[PDB]
Amino acid sequence: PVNPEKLLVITVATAETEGYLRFLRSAEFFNYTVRTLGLGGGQKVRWLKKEMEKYADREDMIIMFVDSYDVILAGSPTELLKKFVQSGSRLLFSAESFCWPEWGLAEQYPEVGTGKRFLNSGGFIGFATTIHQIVRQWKYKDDDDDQLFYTRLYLDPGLREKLSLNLDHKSRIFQNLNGALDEVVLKFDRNRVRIRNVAYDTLPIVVHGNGPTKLQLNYLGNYVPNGWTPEGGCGFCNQDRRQPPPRVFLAVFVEQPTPFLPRFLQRLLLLDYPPDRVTLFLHNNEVFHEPHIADSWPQLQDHFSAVKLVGPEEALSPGEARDMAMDLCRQDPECEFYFSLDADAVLTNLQTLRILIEENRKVIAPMLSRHGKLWSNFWGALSPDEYYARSEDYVELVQRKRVGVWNVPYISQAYVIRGDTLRMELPQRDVFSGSDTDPDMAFCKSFRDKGIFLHLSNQHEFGRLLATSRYDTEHLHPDLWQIFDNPVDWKEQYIHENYSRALEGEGIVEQPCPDVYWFPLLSEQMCDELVAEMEHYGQWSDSRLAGVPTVDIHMKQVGYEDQWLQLLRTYVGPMTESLFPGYHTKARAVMNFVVRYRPDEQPSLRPHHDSSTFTLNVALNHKGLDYEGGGCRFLRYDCVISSPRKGWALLHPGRLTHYHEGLPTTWGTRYIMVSFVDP
Amino acid sequence: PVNPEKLLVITVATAETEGYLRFLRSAEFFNYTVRTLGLGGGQKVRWLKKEMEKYADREDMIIMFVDSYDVILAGSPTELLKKFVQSGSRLLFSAESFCWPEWGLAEQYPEVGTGKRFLNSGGFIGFATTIHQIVRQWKYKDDDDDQLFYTRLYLDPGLREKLSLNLDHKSRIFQNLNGALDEVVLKFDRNRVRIRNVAYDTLPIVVHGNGPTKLQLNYLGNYVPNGWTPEGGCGFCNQDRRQPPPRVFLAVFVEQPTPFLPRFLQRLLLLDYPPDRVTLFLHNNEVFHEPHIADSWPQLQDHFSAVKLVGPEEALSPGEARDMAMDLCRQDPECEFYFSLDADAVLTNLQTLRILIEENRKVIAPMLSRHGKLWSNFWGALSPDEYYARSEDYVELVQRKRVGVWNVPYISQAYVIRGDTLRMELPQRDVFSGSDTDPDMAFCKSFRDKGIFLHLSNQHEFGRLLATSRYDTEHLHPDLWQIFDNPVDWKEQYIHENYSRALEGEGIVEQPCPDVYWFPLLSEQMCDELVAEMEHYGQWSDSRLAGVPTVDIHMKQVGYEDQWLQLLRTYVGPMTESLFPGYHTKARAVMNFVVRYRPDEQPSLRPHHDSSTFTLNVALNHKGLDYEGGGCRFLRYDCVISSPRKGWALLHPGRLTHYHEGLPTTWGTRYIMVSFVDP
Numbered sequence A, B: 001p002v003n004p005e006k007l008l009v010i011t012v013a014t015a016e017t018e019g020y021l022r023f024l025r026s027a028e029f030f031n032y033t034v035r036t037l038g039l040g041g042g043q044k045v046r047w048l049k050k051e052m053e054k055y056a057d058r059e060d061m062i063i064m065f066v067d068s069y070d071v072i073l074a075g076s077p078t079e080l081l082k083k084f085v086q087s088g089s090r091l092l093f094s095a096e097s098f099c100w101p102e103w104g105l106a107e108q109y110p111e112v113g114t115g116k117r118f119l120n121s122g123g124f125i126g127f128a129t130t131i132h133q134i135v136r137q138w139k140y141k142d143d144d145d146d147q148l149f150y151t152r153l154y155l156d157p158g159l160r161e162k163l164s165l166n167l168d169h170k171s172r173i174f175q176n177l178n179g180a181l182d183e184v185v186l187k188f189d190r191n192r193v194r195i196r197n198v199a200y201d202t203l204p205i206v207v208h209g210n211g212p213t214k215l216q217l218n219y220l221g222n223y224v225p226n227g228w229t230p231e232g233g234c235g236f237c238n239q240d241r242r243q244p245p246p247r248v249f250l251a252v253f254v255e256q257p258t259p260f261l262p263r264f265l266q267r268l269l270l271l272d273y274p275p276d277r278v279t280l281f282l283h284n285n286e287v288f289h290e291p292h293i294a295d296s297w298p299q300l301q302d303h304f305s306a307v308k309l310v311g312p313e314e315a316l317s318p319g320e321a322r323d324m325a326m327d328l329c330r331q332d333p334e335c336e337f338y339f340s341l342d343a344d345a346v347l348t349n350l351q352t353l354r355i356l357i358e359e360n361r362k363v364i365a366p367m368l369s370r371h372g373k374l375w376s377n378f379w380g381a382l383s384p385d386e387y388y389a390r391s392e393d394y395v396e397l398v399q400r401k402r403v404g405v406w407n408v409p410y411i412s413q414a415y416v417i418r419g420d421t422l423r424m425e426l427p428q429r430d431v432f433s434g435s436d437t438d439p440d441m442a443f444c445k446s447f448r449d450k451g452i453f454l455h456l457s458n459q460h461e462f463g464r465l466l467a468t469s470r471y472d473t474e475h476l477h478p479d480l481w482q483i484f485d486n487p488v489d490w491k492e493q494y495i496h497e498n499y500s501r502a503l504e505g506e507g508i509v510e511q512p513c514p515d516v517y518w519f520p521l522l523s524e525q526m527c528d529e530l531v532a533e534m535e536h537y538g539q540w541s542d543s544r545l546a547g548v549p550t551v552d553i554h555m556k557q558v559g560y561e562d563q564w565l566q567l568l569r570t571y572v573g574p575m576t577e578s579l580f581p582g583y584h585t586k587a588r589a590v591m592n593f594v595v596r597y598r599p600d601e602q603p604s605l606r607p608h609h610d611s612s613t614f615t616l617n618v619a620l621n622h623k624g625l626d627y628e629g630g631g632c633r634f635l636r637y638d639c640v641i642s643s644p645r646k647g648w649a650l651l652h653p654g655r656l657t658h659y660h661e662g663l664p665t666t667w668g669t670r671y672i673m674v675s676f677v678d679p
């Protein structure tokens, strides 16, 4: 039984990158001793050769040399030394599928049955004496290949047998990922994750993301060895910092017509971060949003430490605008953090900026998804063309079956970047631009090209993404038509704030007349925009029974029937079934129309029955302020609703029993919305 | 100016028939002096010749000889004498269109332009001396024609010129009806009626219904001269009597299957006449009515002085049965009046027998019509074939625009006959039988053949006639299907007695639950016969909405849909419009059915909505006596109708609001009738 205190791990690193630190944390988890050369590829052997002179006689010592930037450790020193002894080798190299650099040498390699045949110098383990005898032979220069130097020495059949050199053909200790991606799966335990090679049924110690397998290693690195575990949750999510706070440049990008932009702009005033510590940059590419931004700008200027607007007049491309905002932070030594936030990102968590800063990463994004769907502001995997690909754990992340902070190949729409990273590691201006590749992908490639991890946190609920795809802007109030595409935000803007409480009970609903129910339905903004949309149409004027017309406009005339029918199904239907227990509705309504009452034209509506099972009657403006005059009188009951409430609706039967009358409007203008449901 | 005291009217009569008395009353109206020969046709001249010897020298005297049985006087003696002087004749005969008996003598008659050419001995006026010179020449015998005797003397041209004989060619004084029916119309005044000859524009004094114009004279006799006047009403209706009362034989004839016979039999017990003075004869030709009559017979026997039933077993024809009943009165000297009453005659006036007896006629019928139509129990006129013909005043009589007691050619279904008339004037037994002519016409001919008037009184409202035409007897309770043909009697039997008061108001209708109305609709007899008709069918088992069947029978299965739909239109529709002001109904209902609740089969009905605008729910039996168990529960109201009332119906909305439940029937059997109206 070899002594773990006799095992030394040697690696090379010239900077403490995130990949090097990820390797080190995996080594510390298993209590390895690590010796790092070069913190102050032929240069690797030069440093190792020098380092090995101290151990030229140490037959008692076992040394494992591995890369660090693209390596993680998955097993303990005890298991590692046990497998090394089981190999019966005195210096065991990692094996792989490809013979590089010299392809011609593939002939001299011994025949291997089912295992890997060729050597890989990214990982080997052996006695210090044997290793010293190999690396002392290096005399070349730093730019010459170390793989071929180790190669050439191995294919010397006399030296291979003298020093007992071997390759780990079946990945018992070393797992090189290149050419073996389909052999490697995660193997889970309670508080630990490692990999299994399903082709050889081994549990390797060293995971080497050699070649173009860096993202596959980033994926494995999110779990192995203590990254995320079924019982402890994620391991580095808590350890890395899970009076005044840092100064932030907040950059907002409006690159397309976007629903609910006034709501987004107002939400910027609500973010829970000292506004005297935030500098706002806003780029707007759309003339459609200029009034929205002009409306909000006085509040934004009074809120934040400084503000800057770059408008459509400047004709900046999205990539040119993102380069500009990011460089404004880069060239300002007081910008400690850069917060990029796209207009289609809805932040429900107002502490999002604090939470992301505390995670203490170079680059980190909050996870945001389209409501109820899988599409999110990140990708788990890339196609070889850098097109989207679904990763093995993407659904679990999006559905928050697994929460944590994840190393991912692509993020978008919202991220927080350390300002010192922009200055020291990505100093160039062409981060998003400079190629015909998409600006958002060019950004991610730029960071991946520097070995900077792109982190994604689903540790908290942060918000959602708006659908902007086919946002029809040919309306006076286009967000009225957003009931299908963004129903969550449509509800928060247009459905009455106290509706849900009324639907759930709590005594909001009233019964002012027998079997006439009264509940809040529409917000004041919905009422104003619906009225304004009706008057914008302008062409004013039904299924009533007396023994009966109104000046009105039907939803179909203005192209709002399908939308109003959706509101009926989603909000009125459930309300009716709660208030008339035993009745069930699909919210059929052929008659949906706004009627206008004025003393100048039609001020009243004579007694009648509606052609409906029940009628919805929503006031749309204020009694007293917008009109003087009565509301609705149900004759068989001697009951009048004298004071209608703007966003509140009446629910009453349409036939037989509720003969009703529209009392004359005596001043101003009275607008109501009425649907004859279930005819 | 000739003196009216110098005018003597001479007529002949061997008995004081109604026609003679009608003539006399018309003579008394104008204050004529009448000398009647023979109260103790050649015999007419013999009596006149003898009578004239007293006046052979009376040049101061004017004498008018007229028949009496078929004559009425229409003008005064003053007008008569004025016209006689204007004629410039000394003996003026009536003229007519036909030369009888000898047709050959038509040549010797003087040419007449537009007027009547030939003589008629039924009426003439002249000086007593001139008349004596003519009638003293008669020496023949009583069976020889008087017309030819007067004829032959007139066509003697020398005697015609010597005595100044003339004919009333243009009907200035005498109006013979035969051959001039289209020349004669009534001329009305305030308190007097006479005739005008429109062909000559005259106002005759003497109306002679000679030949086959006796019925036309009877028609004129109903008005002329003081018969019926626009301002005094009828003149003989009041004058002829308009402790114990006379004994009556009441004869009832059931000659066809007749609706509501139990009601007729019960009504016999209600007639306002001392039953100890009435003897009941009832003939029933129908086996269908034997149970009806057997049911009633103990009450009838205990009510009347004596009773006799002649059943279908005897195989009497209608004419043989009417002869038998009438002869039972004829051969009984204690039968002072015979009252014949057909089963299809509904007497609403319970004093009908008293009223008709008081009118003091030989034969008189109360006017009865089919409800709302013109057909009645009398004819105003006959075709020459004795088929029905409409008279000039028939509609006025039927509509009671003119009321009185009318001399008519035909009566049926109800009449009161003086018993002494049967004994002394119509002693034969073959009154209705003896020929292939219809029994009811043979009866009328028999009386007309004896100069007996058939009177008809519409002075009061007496009753109506049932439709019996196509009475379908293939039912357990055939009168249930009589809603179309006899709706007045159908209502009195089957509609709840307090329905009409409830429809008119008066606080009968109740509202036990909100918008559930409760009113009496069906009589207990309707409920029992409907239930019994359902069980007679036997084959027990819908448009309900829950989140829902019943053991029931639909009206269509038993052939009662059209009838029930008529009840809905006539009685439920108006009730619904009164109780739901503003709602209007045509009473559409596709679902009409009786459901049965029993603990053994289906005892309850789970909560549901009906497929209807409103639902009619009529209990059909008694809670407690027929079943134990609850009724109807409306869930949204916490309101139960625990005690249903047998003939009462519930009226409630069918959709949205009145989710309702049929509480379990725990004993017996519960029957209800339900219609889903206006689906």
Ligand SMILES: *[C@@H]1O[C@H](CO)[C@@H](O[C@@H]2O[C@H](CO)[C@@H](O)[C@H](O)[C@H]2NC(C)=O)[C@H](O)[C@H]1NC(C)=O
Pocket (backbone or CB within 6 Å): A497, A498
């Ligand atoms: C929704 O309901 C809330 C509370 O039921 C309303 O807020 C109240 O408004 C009155 C005056 O308008 C205040 O005196 C109360 O203190 C408020 N309550 C709370 C809890 O703030 C609110 O106005 C309703 N929304 C709308 C649109 O009418």
Ligand SMILES: *[C@@H]1O[C@H](CO)[C@@H](O[C@@H]2O[C@H](CO)[C@@H](O)[C@H](O)[C@H]2NC(C)=O)[C@H](O)[C@H]1NC(C)=O
Pocket (backbone or CB within 6 Å): B497, B498
């Ligand atoms: C129709 O209504 C009348 C009166 O409203 C009911 O007759 C009453 O019946 C009660 C007992 O049943 C008596 O005490 C009253 O004196 C009766 N009133 C009269 C005026 O006679 C009658 O029962 C109702 N008809 C039905 C079929 O229920």
Ligand SMILES: *[C@@H]1O[C@H](CO)[C@@H](O)[C@H](O)[C@H]1NC(C)=O
Pocket (backbone or CB within 6 Å): A029, A030, A031
């Ligand atoms: C690492 O070593 C320490 C003692 O220095 C020990 O307490 C700890 O449990 C070890 N951890 C592992 C994973 O071996």
Ligand SMILES: *[C@@H]1O[C@H](CO)[C@@H](O)[C@H](O)[C@H]1NC(C)=O
Pocket (backbone or CB within 6 Å): B029, B030, B031
């Ligand atoms: C008939 O004569 C009487 C007098 O005797 C007279 O009062 C009456 O008015 C007369 N009537 C007519 C109709 O001439």
Ligand SMILES: O=C(O)CCC(=O)C(=O)O
Pocket (backbone or CB within 6 Å): A544, A550, A595, A605, A610, A617, A631, A632, A660, A661, A662, A663, A672, A674
């Ligand atoms: O003015 C009102 O409140 C009644 C409107 C109404 O009943 C209708 O539009 O049918």
Ligand SMILES: O=C(O)CCC(=O)C(=O)O
Pocket (backbone or CB within 6 Å): B544, B550, B595, B605, B610, B617, B631, B632, B660, B661, B662, B663, B672, B674
């Ligand atoms: O039993 C009752 O009273 C309810 C009957 C009912 O609602 C129905 O027949 O639809």
Ligand SMILES: [Fe+2]
Pocket (backbone or CB within 6 Å): A544, A608, A609, A610, A615, A660
């Ligand atoms: Fe209405």
Ligand SMILES: [Fe+2]
Pocket (backbone or CB within 6 Å): B544, B608, B609, B610, B615, B660
């Ligand atoms: Fe029902």
Ligand SMILES: [Mn+2]
Pocket (backbone or CB within 6 Å): A067, A068, A070, A071, A122, A208, A209, A210
């Ligand atoms: Mn490497």
Ligand SMILES: [Mn+2]
Pocket (backbone or CB within 6 Å): A541, A542, A550, A552, A553, A593
């Ligand atoms: Mn309209």
Ligand SMILES: [Mn+2]
Pocket (backbone or CB within 6 Å): B067, B068, B070, B071, B122, B208, B209, B210
């Ligand atoms: Mn005569």
Ligand SMILES: [Mn+2]
Pocket (backbone or CB within 6 Å): B541, B542, B550, B552, B553, B593
């Ligand atoms: Mn049924």
